[PDB]
Amino acid sequence: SMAERKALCLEMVAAWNRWDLSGIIKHWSPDIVHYSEDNEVSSADMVKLMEGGLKAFPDLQLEVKSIMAEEDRVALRITVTATHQGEFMGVQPTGQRVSWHLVEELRFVDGKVVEHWDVINMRPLLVRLGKLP
Amino acid sequence: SMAERKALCLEMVAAWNRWDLSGIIKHWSPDIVHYSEDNEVSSADMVKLMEGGLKAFPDLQLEVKSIMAEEDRVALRITVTATHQGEFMGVQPTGQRVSWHLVEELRFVDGKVVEHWDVINMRPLLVRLGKLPDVPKVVLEASAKLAAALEHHHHHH
Numbered sequence A: 001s002m003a004e005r006k007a008l009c010l011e012m013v014a015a016w017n018r019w020d021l022s023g024i025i026k027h028w029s030p031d032i033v034h035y036s037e038d039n040e041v042s043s044a045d046m047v048k049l050m051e052g053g054l055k056a057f058p059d060l061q062l063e064v065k066s067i068m069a070e071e072d073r074v075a076l077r078i079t080v081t082a083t084h085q086g087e088f089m090g091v092q093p094t095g096q097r098v099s100w101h102l103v104e105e106l107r108f109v110d111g112k113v114v115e116h117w118d119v120i121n122m123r124p125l126l127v128r129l130g131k132l133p
Numbered sequence B: 001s002m003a004e005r006k007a008l009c010l011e012m013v014a015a016w017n018r019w020d021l022s023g024i025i026k027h028w029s030p031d032i033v034h035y036s037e038d039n040e041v042s043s044a045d046m047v048k049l050m051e052g053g054l055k056a057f058p059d060l061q062l063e064v065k066s067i068m069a070e071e072d073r074v075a076l077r078i079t080v081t082a083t084h085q086g087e088f089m090g091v092q093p094t095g096q097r098v099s100w101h102l103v104e105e106l107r108f109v110d111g112k113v114v115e116h117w118d119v120i121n122m123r124p125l126l127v128r129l130g131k132l133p134d135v136p137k138v139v140l141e142a143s144a145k146l147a148a149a150l151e152h153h154h155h156h157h
Helices: A003-017 A042-057 A122-126 B002-017 B043-056 B121-130 B137-154
Strands: A026-037 A039-041 A061-070 A073-081 A097-108 A112-121 B028-036 B039-041 B061-072 B073-083 B097-109 B112-121
Touching: A003 A061, A003 A073, A003 A097, A026 A042, A061 B061, A061 B073, A073 B061, A073 B097, A097 A122, A097 B073, A097 B112, A112 B097, A122 B073, B002 B061, B002 B073, B002 B097, B028 B043, B039 B043, B039 B061, B097 B121
Parallel strands: A026 A112, B028 B112
Antiparallel strands: A026 A039, A061 A073, A073 A097, A097 A112, A112 B112, B028 B039, B061 B073, B073 B097, B097 B112
C-alpha cells in the first residue's frame, strides 16, 4: 500500500541518518534503474556517489520536509545538512556547515525499488564551496 | 479530488507553455505562501522571477516527467527547455539551447493554491551560462579514478 511504501522510504531515510548505505541499497531491485537530469545513472556509479558523498560529509543528516505517495510511487522532499569534512568537487574540507535540497522519487515492485529519480539543488553548497558567488 | 487538483496543476503548466503568466497566478490564493530552499519568497519577488525568467527564455517549454497527488497536495517533476535569448544572471544571451529540472509542490484550499514549494536544479543551465565548468563525463571519470588512487596510496603500507 501507499502507507507501507512510505514507511519503507522513511526506513531508507533512517538508514542514511545512521550512515548505513547497505540499509538503503538492500531495498533496491537488482534491475533498478536510476535517473538524474533525465539521464540513466548506473548502479555502480550511484553507489560511488553515495560512498563519496558520505566520505565528504560524514555527519550528514536528512530532514524529510514532505512525503507523498500515489500508485506505486513515493516522493520525498528532503533537506540535507552536514559539515564539510572531506575533499568534495576538488575543494579541500573546511569544517563549515553546509546544506542542500532534493526530491527523490521511487517506484516499487514487490517491495523493492525498481526506478529512482532525483532532482538535486546543490546551489547553497556550490556557494559555500566557492563554486558560485 | 486528487484528479481535479492534478488537472488544475496541468492548466498552470499549460499557461507557462503559452507564456501567459496571468493564467498561472489566477490559481493562487490571495494568502498564498511560496517557499524555496526552506525560506519564504514573497509573491512580489516570485512574480518578478517569473517575468524575468520569461524574458530571458521567451520560448521556454515545461515537460511534465511525473505528477503525483495525495491529500490536498500535488507534486510535478518538470524539465524545462528553452533558448537563451535575453540577459540572465548577468550573462548576455547566446541563443544556446538550455535546460533545467525542478519539482514543484502545491497545496490547495477551495481550488486555489495556498502553499507552493520548489526544488530547482539549475546545474545544467549554470554550465551553459559559464557559471560552472563544462567538464566531459570521461574527464570526471578520470578525476574520480585519480582521487581513488591517491586515497589508496594514503592507506597503503
